[PDB]
Amino acid sequence: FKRAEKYVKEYREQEREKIRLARIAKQQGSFHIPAEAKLVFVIRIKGINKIPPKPRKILQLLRLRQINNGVFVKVTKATAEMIKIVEPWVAYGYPNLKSVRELIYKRGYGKVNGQRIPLTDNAIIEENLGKYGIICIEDLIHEIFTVGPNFKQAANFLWPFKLSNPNGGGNREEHINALIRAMN
Amino acid sequence: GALKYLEELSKKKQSDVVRFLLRVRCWEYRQLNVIHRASRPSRPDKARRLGYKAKQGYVIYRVRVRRGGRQLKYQRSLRATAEERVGRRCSNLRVLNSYWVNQDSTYKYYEVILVDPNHKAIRRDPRINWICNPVHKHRECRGLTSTGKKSRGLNKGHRFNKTRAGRRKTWKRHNTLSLWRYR
């Protein structure tokens, strides 16, 4: 059974999201960030129950549906506009070397033939990818950190990470490290 | 505040509210033990005006007493019998006072406010620690409570000539032949 205050709250959130989407669509999508491409970790948090169609399309294009899912994403103009669309549901920022290293060493899984296996062998990842230049796990570690042409296939290869629910641990540039530190 | 209203209500004991409440409570008390511990006074205005304080060391004890004669009438009051029975159950406490709470066809129910003389909250309070003195051991057995003071006729006036200072002391004083040295 569902009460009337839930209905009016829902409608108010949907309306506020609708005006906010109209505001960002009307205004020219230029962030206060230099034109150089960067790298940001994105972890999506519980927020609004009902997702508008453009945010759910962007979240599906960024493959974030399940509970506590995280993905690294480039920073250029189009991706800046995409992450500015889905700001209230995601939290993003610059990761650290130990953050990505520990996060892939504790929770790094792979996708092939539409199924998700744990990273068990380097022979497994070499059978999965083969010939784009990656030869081990440290290879995709510094491929994620140091910029290169092999971002897209490596990001499509990796399952996104199902981090454990914390017990209490906008935009920021360095507090995300403590977040994934407590998220793991 | 509210105790003035409760005093005025307690003064109408056959009105609908008070009659209803008295009957429901009488039913419950009848099915309880003869002498049972009461968590709080059922008549807080009456207990408060008799010296009950919501402080550790103060205890209420409800007691039922069979009503009627002993045509020899018992010169002891039913309220005095109640305090004596409770005082024996709680032999470590001092009977402070007691008051009527209910009456049935065969019983009269009374609540007895008792005080623990060994609790430190009572021994440190100059308003109650007089009861810690050993001259107040079993006040209900020597006619030293309110019922005892009434039944011994301890009042001022010509109507209480033979009992105002003690009946037996007055009788011994009147029946003593005083012979002085120079007669």
């Binding site: 454990s164 017990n167 209490g168 407590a182 793991n184 | -």
Partner: protein, 85 residues
């Protein structure tokens, strides 16, 4: 009993008393230190140091694996960092 008190404070709506009681509890996720004080038991079980080394074989094996192990509800992250350190 202190778990009963912190549950009472949570059910009573007192956030500050809940914070005080969880500070007093020393619950081993915000600290990383062991929940209980185990000085006397390990004193009575190990009277000298070479027995401590003999069990430190397995102890250090457990800890190195645990430092390379991830974190869940029963095994939080802070004492995993303490394992690493």
């Amino acid at each position: 009993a202190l778990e009963k008190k912190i549950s009472r404070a949570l059910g009573r709506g007192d956030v500050s008393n809940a914070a005080r009681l969880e500070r007093n509890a020393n619950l081993p996720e915000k600290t990383g230190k062991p929940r209980y004080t185990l000085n006397h038991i390990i004193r009575e079980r190990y009277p000298t140091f070479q027995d401590a080394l003999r069990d430190l074989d397995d102890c250090l094996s457990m800890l190195f694996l645990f430092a390379n192990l991830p974190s869940t509800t029963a095994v939080p992250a802070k004492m995993i960092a303490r394992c690493e350190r």
